């Protein structure tokens, strides 16, 4: 059935979107607002009053203090705008390289494993966003490995803190330990923790 | 006397082509030249393949000059904000061996 | 004086000035001669204007700007002071203004 | 407890959102070892050069910094329609 209207111009719209991406900062936020709204209309996740972080009655056990406080350092209160935003960011286009909100963990206590788990969950619930911030999380993971596995860390870093895939698809580790800026995300460089090379 | 003088008798004589004793401004007053890559001022080159004479090198006064300056985008001397993050335990800090 | 060209009523002055400007060795100019954009932000940062100003003041002003610019330190380097005045292994995040 | 709500509901929602008109880029391939974003500029002979993806650091939009801690409320402070009398359209 004919509709008396112009065809949707795929080519011209993709071009104008590229131009807007290059010129219009609000654009990223525009698009997120659609997705985010959709998530809200899917009625898929809501905050509750009741937290569930600790088994009873481990929160009451005296030995658990150094653990409990650690978890309480990480656990943000639920807020639907932020939760929906975390959901939407997975599928909205990124026009300004995202950065991890820096963690200051030094990894002395065993309880510090919490931060590592927080990354793992984040790698699972949101593989895309994780893939965007993964080098900056590698910088925390290195302070983790150097404290828990100093020998393996020595060997790993000695191979190289980062790599660059070439033609033929082979990896070439830098051989050089160095902190990874997000300035590298647009570069040929990759964090080396995620090479999955034995 | 009148070492400072740059111009004299800015009036036209109605008979002779220029007044006796009238003095034109030195050409150096008007050569904006360039700013050197170093940041020192230069006069214009007097011939191709020749660099210009630095302005401070000689005794003439030049009254048009390039000045580098900062646009609004720079700013300096502003207080800047940070996030301090104190160590989780005082006993976990290490001093030696650095 | 270079601006008097084709504006001063005086004839000999106008002829002498037009001569000094038409000479190869000199060239008056006013306004924005040069521009330096940021490497990352792309916005212009340090622009060289051709002012009407004595070359001594221009030379000094350019010395100030040159010292400020060629130092290559930002306000992020300030955290290195905060690190010296706060307990060992304290942390300082952001904002990377560059 | 929460896994059914993710994998058997929210999964579908990503799958549909992934087809929305403006979600126009390949954000990830599933391979951390290899994936890099495709990168583009509006460039001209006349000297312009405009990256589509720039790194600029935190913006006014509030979109750039990512707190990973968001993962905690999700695991341990959120109802889902699938998880929680337990019938819910």
């Amino acid at each position: 059935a004919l509709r008396p209207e112009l065809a949707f111009d795929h080519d011209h719209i993709i071009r104008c979107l590229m131009l807007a991406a290059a010129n219009y900062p609000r654009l990223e936020g525009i698009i997120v607002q659609i997705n985010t709204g959709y998530v809200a209309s899917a009625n898929v996740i809501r905050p509750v009053s009741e937290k569930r972080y600790f088994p009873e009655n481990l929160e009451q056990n005296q030995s658990a203090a150094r653990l409990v406080s650690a978890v309480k350092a990480r656990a943000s209160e639920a807020d639907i705008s932020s939760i929906h935003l975390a959901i939407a960011r997975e599928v909205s286009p990124m026009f300004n390289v995202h950065e991890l909100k820096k963690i200051a963990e030094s990894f002395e206590d065993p309880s510090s494993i919490v931060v590592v788990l927080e990354f793992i969950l984040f790698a699972l619930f949101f593989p895309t966003e994780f893939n965007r911030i993964k080098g900056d999380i590698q910088n925390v993971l290195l302070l983790f490995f150097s404290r828990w596995y100093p020998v393996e860390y020595g060997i790993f870093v000695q191979r190289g803190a980062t790599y660059t895939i070439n033609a033929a698809g082979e990896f070439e580790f830098s051989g050089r330990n160095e902190k990874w800026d997000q300035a590298l995300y647009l570069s040929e460089h990759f964090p080396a923790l995620f090479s999955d090379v034995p | 006397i009148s070492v400072a003088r740059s111009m004299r008798a800015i009036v036209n004589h109605n008979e002779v082509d220029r007044p006796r004793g009238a003095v034109a401004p030195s050409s150096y007053e008007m050569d904006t030249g360039t700013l050197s890559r170093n940041g020192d001022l230069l006069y214009s080159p007097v011939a191709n393949g020749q660099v210009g004479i630095p302005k401070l090198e000689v005794d003439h006064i030049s009254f048009s000059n390039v000045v580098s300056m900062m646009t609004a985008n720079i700013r300096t001397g502003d207080d800047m904000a940070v996030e301090r993050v104190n160590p989780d335990d005082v006993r976990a800090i290490n001093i030696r061996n650095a | 004086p270079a601006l008097l060209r084709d504006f001063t009523q005086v004839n000999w002055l106008n002829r002498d000035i037009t001569n000094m400007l038409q000479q190869a060795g000199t060239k008056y100019g006013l306004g924005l001669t040069e521009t330096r954009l940021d490497y990352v932000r792309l916005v212009k940062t340090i622009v060289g204007h051709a002012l009407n100003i004595d070359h001594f003041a221009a030379s000094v002003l350019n010395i100030n700007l040159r010292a400020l610019m060629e130092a290559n330190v930002t306000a992020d380097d300030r955290i290195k002071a905060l690190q010296a005045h706060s307990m060992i292994s304290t942390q300082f995040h952001g904002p990377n203004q560059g | 407890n929460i896994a059914v709500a993710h994998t058997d509901h929210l999964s579908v929602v990503y799958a549909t959102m992934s087809n929305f008109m403006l979600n126009f880029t390949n954000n990830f391939s599933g391979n951390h070892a290899t994936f890099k974003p495709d990168q583009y500029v509006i460039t001209s002979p006349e000297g312009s050069y405009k990256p589509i993806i720039e790194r600029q650091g935190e913006t006014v939009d509030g979109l750039t910094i990512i707190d990973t801690s968001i993962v905690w409320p999700i695991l341990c402070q959120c109802t889902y329609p699938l998880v929680r009398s337990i019938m819910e359209e």
């Binding site: 807020d79 935003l85 | 300096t76 001397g77 207080d79 904000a81 940070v82 | 952001g94 904002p95 | 707190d67």
Partner: peptide
């Protein structure tokens, strides 16, 4: 505590 996507600034250095 509460989620925050920005840098949670809490000091100001003087020049």
């Amino acid at each position: 505590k509460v989620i925050f996507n920005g840098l949670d600034v809490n000091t100001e250095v003087q020049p």
